[PDB]
Amino acid sequence: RVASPSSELRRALEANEFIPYYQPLSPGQGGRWIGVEVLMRWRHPREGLIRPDLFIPFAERSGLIVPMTRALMRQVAEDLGGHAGKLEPGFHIGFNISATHCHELALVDDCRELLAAFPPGHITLVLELTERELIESSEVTDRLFDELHALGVKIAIDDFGTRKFQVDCLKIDQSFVARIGIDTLSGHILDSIVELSAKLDLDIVAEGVETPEQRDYLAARGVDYLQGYLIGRPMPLESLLSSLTVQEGQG
Numbered sequence: 292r293v294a295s296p297s298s299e300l301r302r303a304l305e306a307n308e309f310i311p312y313y314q315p316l317s318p319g320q321g322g323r324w325i326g327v328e329v330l331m332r333w334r335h336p337r338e339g340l341i342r343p344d345l346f347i348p349f350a351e352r353s354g355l356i357v358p359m360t361r362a363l364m365r366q367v368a369e370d371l372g373g374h375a376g377k378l379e380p381g382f383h384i385g386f387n388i389s390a391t392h393c394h395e396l397a398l399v400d401d402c403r404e405l406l407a408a409f410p411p412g413h414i415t416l417v418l419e420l421t422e423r424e425l426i427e428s429s430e431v432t433d434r435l436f437d438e439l440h441a442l443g444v445k446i447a448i449d450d451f452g453t454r455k456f457q458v459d460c461l462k463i464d465q466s467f468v469a470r471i472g473i474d475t476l477s478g479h480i481l482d483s484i485v486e487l488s489a490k491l492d493l494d495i496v497a498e499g500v501e502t503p504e505q506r507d508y509l510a511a512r513g514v515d516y517l518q519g520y521l522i523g524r525p526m527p528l529e530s531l532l533s534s535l536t537v538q539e540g541q542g
């Protein structure tokens with residue numbers, strides 16, 4: 292009896308096999324990193340560094356994604372809370388959140404605990420939800436989103452464009468960025484998302500910026516922040532600290 296995917300994930304979680312990788316965001320117009328998206332990685336003893344799409348789906352169905360995310364947040368506080376010195380005041384730290392998470396308030400404690408691992412106001416904690424994760428729990432029962440804002444947590448909509456709330460940020464899915472220059476329809480729709488963000492007073496991140504064409508196009512329309520291989524791949528702690536060290540020493 293080789294035990295299941297279930298016991299496998301709980302095992303890994305007890306053995307902290309789930310680690311943060313960190314992808315930088317950069318301002319639309321370039322410059323020092325202003326934040327990171329924390330991306331889960333599974334460092335598997337047997338198989339190597341396994342990537343999220345192979346395991347986040349079972350985490351969500353089994354419910355284990357909730358504890359997993361808590362562990363990840365604690366790890367990030369441990370990873371970065373001692374090195375606040377290297378982080379531009381207001382540095383954004385984003386975490387991907389599941390729909391299961393949006394039930395009940397514990398999440399508020401987790402956010403409070405992380406925030407409390409840095410000096411007050413020195414970072415901005417962001418939570419990324421996809422549009423369908425808001426669908427399914429629609430609208431009403433959310434003192435949760437009120438309680439999170441009153442601690443200064445921000446809410447971003449992930450993979451946007453692929454209803455309602457107080458959300459603070461939109462992240463343009465990489466699918467639109469990928470088609471810049473190459474199709475006018477896609478371009479116009481993307482200009483619309485951008486224009487809407489501004490009407491509603493939301494910040495906007497473009498994800499999957501890989502080329503200078505893409506970067507320049509987005510910048511020309513006042514996209515607030517960029518993320519992608521052009522700026523930097525997802526990377527382990529050591530590389531992030533090394534790269535931030537460089538950025539503090541010249542500007």
Ligand SMILES: Nc1nc2c(ncn2[C@@H]2O[C@@H]3COP(=O)(O)O[C@H]4[C@@H](O)[C@H](n5cnc6c(=O)[nH]c(N)nc65)O[C@@H]4COP(=O)(O)O[C@H]3[C@H]2O)c(=O)[nH]1
Nearest residue numbers: 330331342343344347387388389450499500501519520525
């Ligand atoms: N082609 C291309 N790809 C790029 C580029 N820049 C970044 N990426 C990849 O795009 C994904 C981040 O997007 P996501 O919409 O959060 O998509 C994430 C997110 O939905 C989910 N995920 C990751 N960590 C967590 C987590 O801790 N909790 C939850 N619920 N989901 C997570 O897994 C998805 C994939 O994560 P990764 O495999 O790390 O894949 C990452 C990242 O490595 C680029 O320039 N080009």
Ligand SMILES: [Ca+2]
Nearest residue numbers: 387388389421
């Ligand atoms: Ca998610």
Ligand SMILES: [Ca+2]
Nearest residue numbers: 328387419449
């Ligand atoms: Ca995301």
Ligand SMILES: [Ca+2]
Nearest residue numbers: 450464465498
């Ligand atoms: Ca995306």
